[PDB]
Coordinates of C-alpha atoms and ligand atoms in Angstrom, one line a residue:
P28 CA -8.0 -2.9 -27.1
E29 CA -10.2 0.5 -27.1
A30 CA -9.4 1.6 -23.5
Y31 CA -5.5 3.1 -22.9
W32 CA -4.6 1.2 -19.8
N33 CA -5.8 -2.4 -21.4
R34 CA -4.1 -1.1 -24.8
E35 CA -0.9 -0.5 -23.2
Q36 CA -0.7 -3.4 -20.8
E37 CA -1.4 -5.4 -23.6
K38 CA 1.8 -4.3 -25.6
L39 CA 4.2 -4.4 -22.5
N40 CA 2.6 -8.4 -22.8
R41 CA 4.1 -8.8 -26.0
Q42 CA 7.4 -7.2 -25.1
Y43 CA 7.7 -9.8 -21.7
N44 CA 6.1 -12.8 -23.4
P45 CA 7.8 -14.2 -26.6
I46 CA 4.7 -16.7 -27.0
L47 CA 3.0 -13.2 -27.8
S48 CA 5.2 -12.5 -31.0
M49 CA 3.2 -14.1 -33.7
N62 CA 10.1 3.3 -28.2
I63 CA 10.5 5.3 -24.5
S64 CA 10.9 3.6 -21.1
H65 CA 7.6 2.3 -19.5
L66 CA 9.6 2.6 -16.4
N67 CA 12.1 5.8 -15.7
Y68 CA 10.3 8.0 -18.7
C69 CA 9.9 11.2 -16.9
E70 CA 9.1 13.7 -18.9
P71 CA 5.5 14.6 -19.6
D72 CA 4.3 11.5 -22.1
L73 CA 2.4 14.2 -24.8
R74 CA 1.1 11.1 -27.2
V75 CA -1.3 10.6 -24.4
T76 CA -2.9 14.1 -25.4
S77 CA -3.5 12.4 -29.0
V78 CA -4.8 8.9 -28.3
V79 CA -7.2 9.5 -25.5
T80 CA -10.2 10.3 -26.7
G81 CA -11.4 13.3 -24.4
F82 CA -8.3 13.9 -22.9
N83 CA -9.1 17.7 -21.9
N84 CA -12.2 16.8 -20.5
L85 CA -10.9 14.3 -18.0
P86 CA -10.2 15.4 -14.3
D87 CA -7.0 16.7 -13.5
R88 CA -5.7 13.6 -11.4
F89 CA -6.5 11.4 -14.9
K90 CA -4.3 13.8 -16.5
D91 CA -1.5 13.7 -14.4
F92 CA -1.5 9.4 -13.6
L93 CA -1.8 9.6 -18.1
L94 CA 1.1 12.1 -18.3
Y95 CA 3.6 10.6 -16.0
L96 CA 2.6 6.7 -16.2
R97 CA 6.2 5.6 -16.8
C98 CA 7.7 7.6 -14.4
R99 CA 8.4 5.4 -11.5
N100 CA 12.0 6.0 -10.2
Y101 CA 11.5 7.8 -7.0
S102 CA 14.2 8.3 -5.0
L103 CA 14.3 8.3 -0.7
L104 CA 14.3 11.5 0.9
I105 CA 14.2 10.0 3.9
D106 CA 15.0 6.4 4.6
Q107 CA 15.8 3.9 7.8
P108 CA 18.5 1.7 5.8
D109 CA 18.5 -0.1 9.2
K110 CA 14.9 -0.9 10.3
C111 CA 15.4 -4.5 9.9
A112 CA 19.0 -4.9 11.2
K113 CA 17.3 -7.2 13.0
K114 CA 15.6 -10.1 11.0
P115 CA 11.5 -9.0 11.6
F116 CA 9.0 -11.5 11.7
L117 CA 5.8 -9.4 11.1
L118 CA 7.0 -5.8 9.1
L119 CA 4.1 -3.1 9.9
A120 CA 3.7 -0.6 6.7
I121 CA 1.3 1.9 7.1
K122 CA 0.2 4.4 4.1
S123 CA 0.2 7.7 5.6
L124 CA 0.5 11.3 4.1
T125 CA 2.4 14.6 5.9
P126 CA -0.5 15.9 8.3
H127 CA -1.5 12.7 9.9
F128 CA 0.7 13.1 13.0
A129 CA -2.1 12.2 15.4
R130 CA -3.0 9.2 13.3
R131 CA 0.5 8.2 13.3
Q132 CA 1.2 8.5 17.2
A133 CA -1.5 6.5 18.0
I134 CA -0.1 3.9 15.9
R135 CA 2.7 4.0 17.5
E136 CA 1.2 3.9 20.9
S137 CA -1.1 0.9 20.5
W138 CA -1.4 -1.8 17.5
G139 CA 1.9 -0.4 16.1
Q140 CA 4.2 -0.6 18.6
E141 CA 7.5 -2.3 18.0
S142 CA 8.1 -5.6 19.8
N143 CA 9.9 -8.6 20.3
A144 CA 8.0 -11.3 22.5
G145 CA 9.0 -14.7 22.2
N146 CA 12.0 -13.3 19.7
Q147 CA 9.3 -12.6 16.7
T148 CA 10.5 -8.7 16.2
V149 CA 7.9 -6.8 14.9
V150 CA 8.9 -3.4 13.1
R151 CA 7.0 -0.1 11.6
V152 CA 7.8 1.8 9.0
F153 CA 4.9 4.8 7.8
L154 CA 5.2 5.3 3.8
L155 CA 4.7 8.9 2.9
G156 CA 5.1 10.7 -0.2
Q157 CA 6.0 14.7 -1.0
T158 CA 3.2 17.7 0.1
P159 CA 4.9 20.4 -1.5
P160 CA 4.1 23.5 -1.6
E161 CA 3.3 23.8 -5.1
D162 CA 0.5 22.3 -4.8
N163 CA -0.9 24.7 -1.8
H164 CA -0.2 22.2 1.3
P165 CA 0.9 24.2 4.4
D166 CA 4.4 23.7 5.1
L167 CA 5.2 21.1 7.7
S168 CA 8.4 20.0 7.4
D169 CA 10.4 21.1 10.1
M170 CA 7.2 18.9 11.9
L171 CA 8.0 15.9 9.6
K172 CA 11.6 16.1 10.3
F173 CA 11.2 16.6 13.8
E174 CA 8.7 13.6 13.7
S175 CA 11.2 11.7 12.1
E176 CA 14.3 12.4 14.1
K177 CA 12.3 11.2 17.4
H178 CA 10.6 8.4 16.3
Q179 CA 12.8 7.1 13.1
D180 CA 9.6 5.5 11.7
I181 CA 9.2 7.2 8.6
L182 CA 9.9 6.6 5.0
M183 CA 9.1 9.4 2.4
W184 CA 10.3 9.5 -1.3
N185 CA 10.3 12.3 -3.5
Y186 CA 7.0 12.2 -5.8
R187 CA 3.4 14.2 -5.2
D188 CA 1.9 12.2 -2.8
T189 CA -2.0 11.8 -4.3
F190 CA -5.1 9.1 -4.4
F191 CA -4.1 8.3 -8.1
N192 CA -0.4 7.7 -6.7
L193 CA -1.1 5.1 -4.1
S194 CA 0.2 2.5 -6.8
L195 CA 3.6 4.1 -7.1
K196 CA 3.7 4.4 -2.9
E197 CA 2.9 0.5 -3.5
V198 CA 5.9 -0.5 -6.1
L199 CA 8.5 1.7 -3.9
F200 CA 7.8 0.1 -0.7
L201 CA 8.0 -3.1 -2.3
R202 CA 11.3 -1.3 -3.6
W203 CA 12.4 -0.6 -0.5
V204 CA 11.4 -4.2 1.3
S205 CA 13.7 -5.7 -1.8
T206 CA 16.6 -3.6 -1.2
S207 CA 15.9 -2.8 2.8
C208 CA 14.3 -5.7 4.0
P209 CA 14.1 -9.0 2.3
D210 CA 14.6 -11.0 5.5
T211 CA 10.8 -10.3 6.6
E212 CA 8.8 -13.0 7.3
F213 CA 5.6 -11.7 6.6
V214 CA 4.6 -7.8 5.7
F215 CA 1.4 -6.6 6.8
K216 CA 0.7 -2.9 4.8
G217 CA -2.1 -0.9 5.7
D218 CA -4.2 2.6 6.6
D219 CA -3.5 4.6 8.8
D220 CA -7.1 4.9 9.7
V221 CA -8.0 1.1 10.7
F222 CA -7.1 -0.7 14.0
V223 CA -5.3 -4.0 13.5
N224 CA -5.3 -6.8 16.0
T225 CA -1.7 -7.2 15.7
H226 CA -1.4 -9.9 18.9
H227 CA -4.5 -12.1 16.7
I228 CA -2.2 -11.8 13.6
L229 CA 0.9 -12.9 15.3
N230 CA -1.7 -16.2 16.4
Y231 CA -2.4 -16.2 13.0
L232 CA 0.9 -16.4 11.4
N233 CA 2.2 -19.2 14.0
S234 CA -0.5 -21.5 13.3
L235 CA 0.5 -21.4 9.6
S236 CA 2.2 -24.4 8.0
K237 CA 5.4 -23.6 6.4
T238 CA 3.7 -24.0 3.0
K239 CA 0.5 -22.1 3.6
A240 CA 3.0 -19.2 4.8
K241 CA 5.0 -19.4 1.7
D242 CA 2.6 -17.4 -0.6
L243 CA 0.1 -16.3 2.2
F244 CA -2.0 -13.5 0.8
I245 CA -4.9 -12.3 2.6
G246 CA -7.5 -9.7 3.1
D247 CA -10.5 -8.6 2.4
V248 CA -10.5 -10.2 -1.4
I249 CA -13.3 -8.9 -3.8
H250 CA -14.3 -10.7 -7.1
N251 CA -15.3 -10.0 -10.6
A252 CA -15.6 -5.9 -9.6
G253 CA -15.4 -3.4 -12.1
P254 CA -14.5 -0.3 -12.5
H255 CA -16.8 2.6 -11.1
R256 CA -18.3 4.8 -14.0
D257 CA -20.4 6.8 -11.7
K258 CA -18.2 9.9 -12.4
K259 CA -19.4 11.7 -8.9
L260 CA -17.4 8.7 -7.3
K261 CA -14.4 8.5 -6.0
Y262 CA -13.2 5.6 -7.4
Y263 CA -14.7 6.3 -10.7
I264 CA -12.7 5.2 -13.8
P265 CA -13.7 6.6 -17.6
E266 CA -14.2 3.9 -20.0
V267 CA -11.9 5.7 -22.1
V268 CA -9.4 4.5 -19.4
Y269 CA -10.3 1.0 -18.3
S270 CA -12.9 -1.8 -19.8
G271 CA -13.5 -5.2 -18.4
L272 CA -13.7 -6.3 -14.4
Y273 CA -10.6 -6.2 -12.4
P274 CA -8.8 -9.2 -10.7
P275 CA -9.6 -10.3 -7.7
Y276 CA -8.5 -7.9 -5.3
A277 CA -7.5 -7.3 -1.4
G278 CA -8.8 -3.8 -0.3
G279 CA -10.6 -1.8 1.8
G280 CA -7.4 -1.3 4.3
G281 CA -5.2 -3.4 5.2
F282 CA -3.8 -7.2 4.0
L283 CA -1.2 -9.6 5.4
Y284 CA 1.0 -11.2 3.0
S285 CA 4.4 -12.9 3.3
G286 CA 7.9 -11.6 3.1
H287 CA 9.0 -14.4 0.3
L288 CA 5.5 -12.9 -2.0
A289 CA 6.7 -9.7 -1.4
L290 CA 9.9 -9.9 -3.3
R291 CA 8.3 -11.8 -6.3
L292 CA 5.4 -9.1 -6.1
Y293 CA 8.7 -6.5 -6.4
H294 CA 9.7 -8.4 -9.4
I295 CA 7.2 -8.4 -11.2
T296 CA 5.6 -5.1 -10.9
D297 CA 7.8 -4.0 -14.0
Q298 CA 5.6 -5.9 -16.4
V299 CA 2.2 -4.4 -15.0
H300 CA 1.8 -0.6 -16.0
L301 CA 0.7 1.8 -12.6
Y302 CA -3.2 2.0 -12.1
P303 CA -5.1 4.8 -10.7
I304 CA -6.2 1.9 -7.7
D305 CA -3.1 0.7 -5.5
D306 CA -5.3 -2.4 -4.4
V307 CA -6.2 -3.1 -7.7
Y308 CA -2.9 -2.7 -9.1
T309 CA -1.7 -5.3 -6.5
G310 CA -4.4 -7.6 -7.5
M311 CA -3.0 -7.3 -10.9
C312 CA 0.3 -8.3 -10.1
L313 CA -0.8 -11.1 -8.1
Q314 CA -2.5 -12.3 -11.0
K315 CA 0.5 -12.2 -13.4
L316 CA 2.3 -14.4 -10.2
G317 CA -0.6 -17.4 -11.1
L318 CA -1.9 -16.5 -7.7
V319 CA -5.2 -15.5 -6.1
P320 CA -5.7 -13.4 -3.3
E321 CA -7.8 -15.2 -0.4
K322 CA -10.6 -13.9 1.8
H323 CA -10.5 -14.0 5.3
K324 CA -13.0 -13.2 7.7
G325 CA -11.6 -11.6 9.7
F326 CA -10.4 -8.4 8.0
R327 CA -13.7 -5.9 8.3
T328 CA -13.3 -3.2 5.9
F329 CA -17.2 -1.7 6.8
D330 CA -17.0 -2.4 10.4
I331 CA -18.8 -4.4 12.4
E332 CA -22.6 -4.2 13.8
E333 CA -22.8 -0.9 15.9
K334 CA -24.5 -2.1 18.9
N335 CA -20.8 -4.3 19.2
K336 CA -18.7 -1.6 18.4
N337 CA -18.8 -0.9 22.3
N338 CA -17.9 -4.2 23.4
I339 CA -14.1 -5.6 23.5
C340 CA -15.1 -9.2 22.8
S341 CA -16.2 -8.1 19.1
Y342 CA -12.3 -7.5 18.6
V343 CA -10.6 -10.4 19.8
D344 CA -11.2 -12.5 16.7
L345 CA -10.7 -9.9 14.3
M346 CA -7.8 -8.9 12.0
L347 CA -8.5 -5.3 11.6
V348 CA -11.5 -2.9 11.3
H349 CA -11.8 0.0 9.6
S350 CA -11.7 2.8 10.5
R351 CA -11.5 4.2 13.9
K352 CA -10.0 8.0 15.3
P353 CA -6.4 7.9 16.9
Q354 CA -8.4 8.0 20.3
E355 CA -10.6 4.9 19.9
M356 CA -7.6 3.0 18.7
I357 CA -5.8 3.9 21.9
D358 CA -9.2 3.1 23.6
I359 CA -9.7 -0.7 21.8
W360 CA -6.0 -1.1 22.5
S361 CA -6.0 -0.6 26.1
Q362 CA -9.2 -2.5 26.8
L363 CA -7.6 -5.4 24.4
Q364 CA -5.0 -5.6 26.6
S365 CA -7.3 -7.1 29.3
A366 CA -9.8 -8.9 27.0
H367 CA -8.9 -12.2 28.1
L368 CA -10.2 -11.8 31.6
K369 CA -13.4 -10.7 30.4
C370 CA -14.3 -12.5 27.3
Ligands
LIG401 C1 15.2 -15.8 21.9 O1 16.3 -15.0 21.5 C2 17.6 -15.3 22.9 C3 19.0 -14.8 22.4 O2 18.5 -13.2 21.5 C4 18.6 -12.1 22.7 O3 17.5 -12.5 24.1 C5 16.4 -12.0 23.8 C6 15.6 -12.7 25.2 C7 16.3 -10.3 23.7 O4 16.6 -9.9 24.4 C8 17.5 -10.5 22.1 O5 16.9 -9.0 21.7 C9 18.5 -10.6 22.3 O6 19.4 -10.4 21.3 C10 17.7 -17.0 23.3 O7 18.5 -16.6 24.8 C11 19.8 -17.5 24.6 O8 19.3 -18.7 24.8 C12 20.2 -19.4 25.0 C13 19.6 -20.7 24.8 O9 19.0 -21.1 26.2 C14 21.6 -19.1 26.0 O10 22.3 -20.0 26.1 C15 22.7 -20.3 27.8 O11 24.1 -19.8 27.9 C16 24.7 -20.4 29.2 C17 25.7 -19.0 29.3 O12 27.1 -19.7 28.7 C18 28.5 -19.1 28.8 O13 28.8 -19.8 29.7 C19 28.9 -21.3 30.2 C20 29.8 -21.0 31.5 O14 28.6 -21.1 32.6 C21 29.6 -21.8 29.2 O15 29.7 -23.1 29.0 C22 29.1 -20.8 27.4 O16 29.9 -21.8 26.5 C23 28.6 -19.6 27.4 O17 30.2 -19.1 27.3 C24 24.8 -21.2 29.4 O18 25.0 -21.8 30.9 C25 23.4 -22.2 29.1 O19 23.8 -23.4 29.1 C26 22.8 -24.7 29.5 O20 21.7 -25.1 28.7 C27 22.7 -25.2 27.6 C28 21.3 -25.3 26.4 O21 20.7 -27.0 26.5 C29 23.5 -26.6 27.7 O22 24.5 -27.1 26.4 C30 24.2 -26.3 29.3 O23 24.8 -27.8 29.0 C31 23.8 -25.4 30.3 O24 22.6 -26.6 30.8 C32 23.0 -21.8 27.8 O25 23.9 -22.1 26.4 C33 21.9 -17.7 26.2 O26 22.5 -17.5 27.2 C34 20.3 -17.1 26.1 N1 20.8 -15.3 25.6 C35 20.2 -14.5 26.3 C36 20.6 -13.0 25.8 O27 20.0 -14.6 26.9 C37 16.1 -17.4 23.8 O28 16.8 -19.0 23.8 C38 15.3 -17.3 22.6 N2 14.5 -18.1 22.9 C39 13.1 -17.4 23.8 C40 12.0 -18.3 23.6 O29 13.6 -16.5 24.3
LIG402 C1 2.8 11.2 -9.2 O1 3.7 11.8 -8.7 C2 4.9 12.4 -9.9 C3 5.7 12.7 -9.1 O2 5.8 13.3 -8.3 C4 4.0 13.9 -10.2 O3 4.9 14.0 -11.5 C5 5.0 15.1 -11.5 O4 3.6 15.9 -12.2 C6 4.1 17.8 -12.3 C7 2.6 18.3 -12.2 O5 1.7 17.7 -11.3 C8 4.9 17.8 -13.2 O6 5.1 19.1 -13.2 C9 4.8 20.1 -14.0 O7 5.8 19.5 -15.2 C10 5.6 20.3 -16.7 C11 6.4 19.4 -17.7 O8 7.5 20.1 -17.4 C12 8.2 19.9 -18.5 O9 8.0 20.9 -19.3 C13 8.5 22.3 -19.2 C14 8.2 23.3 -20.7 O10 8.3 22.1 -21.8 C15 9.8 22.5 -18.5 O11 9.8 24.4 -18.2 C16 9.6 22.2 -17.1 O12 11.4 22.1 -16.9 C17 9.9 20.3 -17.7 O13 10.6 19.9 -18.6 C18 5.2 22.0 -16.3 O14 4.7 22.3 -17.1 C19 4.1 22.0 -15.2 O15 4.6 23.5 -15.0 C20 3.4 24.1 -14.4 O16 2.7 23.9 -13.2 C21 4.5 24.7 -12.7 C22 4.6 24.6 -10.9 O17 3.2 24.6 -10.4 C23 4.3 26.1 -12.7 O18 5.7 26.6 -12.7 C24 4.0 26.5 -14.6 O19 3.9 27.8 -14.8 C25 3.0 25.3 -15.0 O20 1.3 26.0 -14.6 C26 4.9 21.8 -13.9 O21 5.8 22.0 -13.5 C27 6.2 17.1 -12.7 O22 7.0 17.4 -14.0 C28 6.1 15.2 -12.5 N1 7.5 14.9 -12.0 C29 7.9 14.1 -12.8 C30 9.5 13.5 -11.8 O23 7.2 13.7 -13.3 C31 2.5 13.2 -10.4 O24 1.7 14.7 -11.0 C32 1.8 12.6 -9.9 N2 0.5 11.7 -10.4 C33 -0.5 11.9 -10.1 C34 -1.8 10.8 -10.3 O25 -1.0 12.7 -8.9
LIG403 C1 14.6 8.2 -14.0 O1 15.9 8.0 -14.7 C2 15.8 8.6 -15.8 C3 17.0 8.2 -16.6 O2 17.8 8.2 -16.0 C4 15.6 10.0 -15.8 O3 15.9 11.0 -16.8 C5 16.7 11.9 -17.0 O4 16.3 12.9 -15.8 C6 15.7 14.3 -16.0 C7 14.4 13.9 -16.0 O5 13.9 14.3 -17.4 C8 16.7 15.0 -17.5 O6 17.0 15.9 -16.5 C9 17.0 13.6 -18.2 O7 17.3 14.4 -19.4 C10 16.3 13.1 -18.1 N1 16.4 11.8 -19.4 C11 17.6 10.6 -19.3 C12 18.1 10.0 -20.7 O8 18.4 10.9 -18.4 C13 14.8 10.3 -14.7 O9 15.4 11.5 -14.0 C14 14.7 9.6 -13.3 N2 13.2 10.1 -12.7 C15 13.8 10.1 -11.4 C16 12.1 11.1 -10.4 O10 14.9 10.6 -11.1
UDP404 O1 -2.5 10.3 -1.0 C1 -3.2 9.9 -0.3 C2 -4.4 9.5 0.1 C3 -4.5 8.8 0.8 N1 -3.3 7.8 1.8 C4 -3.2 7.0 2.8 O2 -4.3 5.7 2.1 C5 -4.8 5.4 3.1 C6 -6.3 5.3 2.2 O3 -6.9 6.8 2.3 P1 -8.6 6.5 2.4 O4 -9.1 5.9 3.4 O5 -9.0 8.1 2.6 O6 -9.3 5.8 1.5 P2 -10.9 5.0 1.9 O7 -10.6 4.1 2.9 O8 -11.6 6.2 1.6 O9 -11.2 4.1 1.0 C7 -5.3 6.1 4.2 O10 -4.5 5.7 5.5 C8 -4.1 7.7 3.9 O11 -2.9 7.8 4.9 C9 -2.2 8.2 1.3 O12 -1.1 7.4 2.1 N2 -2.0 9.0 0.5
CL405 CL1 -4.2 13.1 12.1
MG406 MG1 -10.2 5.0 5.2

């Protein structure tokens, strides 16, 4: 093709599919891929995030700096994996106190990790390392890898997390992967999972799924992707703050990640991997990624049959969760 990502992905396809038959690694090449500055038309005028994405696309072998290797010592029913950034201490603590608390009702173990990269001083971030170490020692729920935690590296955050599931939590029944600014009704999710047949549970992947979306071409927008980077439509994908899937599918997704080049939008990348497995993510009405009706925001009964709501502040998560604990008496 003409777009850089599509062209390189087609090269990967030929490498993994003999039926298409008629030098540097794409997985552990971690020097700058200087060839991109000549083959990508207008490279020098792209925003810095695109330059860095294209230069280091072929590197994904990053190591854990903070690990919790025994997080799944007891086999989880539901692993909560929450994407976060170093300075988001209040968001993480609110989640710990509310919908993300670990629990074991009915022997269905719920365990929690936060997913971080580095916020390094050479990028002008304040040094919060001692505070992060303090939080990690106390709460034992931080996983942190040695890559730059940026918007366009979130598909790295996804691949490295899936790698961690395969190495350190391969027996979890289900995975919820979400953002640290959503409210999640964990009780409703557990009730939903216990209503699933084994057949439906095996390849479960639900969220707020969008079909036939394409890249935004408006250069001002957060999710802007230039025509020189990607052409065509996006596969169906769950986006908007969280999605829910089986541990069995987590392992299959991890295996397939080597065959898909990283993409600047993490939720599109996950949709690409699901597509390569031959699966279609399923839309579920309980994922409210653009909130609920203004007058309903005040009523706790509005939250009882929801799976998640985007977005809520730390104080709102705790207030909602607390009211929810007695919602069966009022709704
Ligand atoms: C959830 O998992 C539970 C186990 O996990 C632990 O507990 C939970 C609550 C969490 O805290 C988790 O973190 C823990 O890891 C599980 O609990 C277990 O359930 C079984 C079955 O009910 C219990 O077995 C009973 O054991 C007692 C003690 O037996 C010993 O002493 C007698 C001497 O009297 C000897 O004969 C025995 O060989 C043992 O050496 C038995 O008295 C009892 O026997 C009766 O029931 C059986 C089964 O019908 C009959 O065959 C007998 O004839 C008796 O009528 C049970 O065998 C076990 O104690 C219990 N563990 C704990 C730690 O409580 C729980 O069932 C899971 N499910 C739910 C919904 O919680
Ligand atoms: C996703 O996350 C990954 C992993 O963290 C990021 O990859 C790193 O990206 C940074 C840039 O942000 C890379 O650092 C840069 O490397 C350049 C190349 O270094 C090589 O070449 C020079 C010269 O030949 C050698 O001296 C050097 O030792 C290496 O062999 C450097 O030229 C850059 O230098 C510039 O910045 C530094 C520090 O700010 C200054 O001192 C310099 O003067 C100059 O201004 C810079 O160091 C880093 O190598 C990447 N790491 C890995 C493991 O690949 C991605 O950027 C990130 N992606 C997105 C989209 O955010
Ligand atoms: C990923 O693995 C590769 C391959 O082992 C590592 O590449 C070496 O590491 C650095 C990065 O360029 C250099 O010192 C070596 O010359 C690299 N080349 C080779 C051939 O090994 C790479 O470092 C790893 N990436 C990370 C982030 O750990
Ligand atoms: O560099 C980043 C930026 C975002 N996030 C996390 O990813 C989620 C998505 O971020 P954001 O809410 O800004 O995206 P949006 O909802 O606006 O699409 C948030 O929970 C952040 O904590 C991250 O982990 N690293
Ligand atoms: Cl915060
Ligand atoms: Mg958000």
